Design a protein around this nucleic acid. Structure first.
Length: 88
RNA sequence: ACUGAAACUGUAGUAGAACCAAUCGGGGUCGUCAAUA
C-alpha cells in the first residue's frame, strides 16, 4: 500500500541540521539533490516513531514495555541495537 | 544460489554590553528713500 502521503506544513522556521556549519555559518541545513531544503525520511520516521511511542506510553499507562509498545515495534519495527541479552 | 533489519544530527547557549540627540542663540528693533537736468 503505497500512495499514502504525509504532508508536513512548517509553521515556524525550521532546521534539519547536518551536525556542522560551513565557514561563516555555524549550523547549515540539509539540502536535497536539487539544493533545496527537505526533511529526510530518516528524520521523518524518527519524529513520527517518537510520537507514536508517546501515544503508546499513554495507552500502556506508562508501562515502557507492554501491549501497545509492541504495536510500535510492529508498525515501526524492533530496535535491536538497543536490546541486549538473548532476544530470541 | 537471493536487497539485512532497526537508529530524529540532535542536545545546551537571550544578538548583546556601553553611549543624554545634544551644544550656541533676549522674538528683537530707526533713519530716509530715489537720480536726474
Amino acid at each position: 500500500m503505497r500512495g499514502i502521503e504525509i504532508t508536513i506544513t512548517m509553521q515556524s522556521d525550521w532546521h534539519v541540521g547536518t551536525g556542522m556549519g560551513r565557514g561563516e555559518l555555524d549550523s547549515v541545513v540539509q539540502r536535497d539533490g536539487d539544493n533545496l531544503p527537505y526533511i529526510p525520511g530518516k528524520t521523518l520516521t524518527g519524529i513520527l516513531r517518537d510520537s507514536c511511542e508517546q501515544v503508546a506510553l499513554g495507552l500502556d499507562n506508562g508501562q515502557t514495555r507492554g501491549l501497545w509498545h509492541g504495536w510500535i515495534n510492529f508498525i515501526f519495527g524492533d530496535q535491536p541495537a538497543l536490546a541486549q541479552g538473548a532476544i530470541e
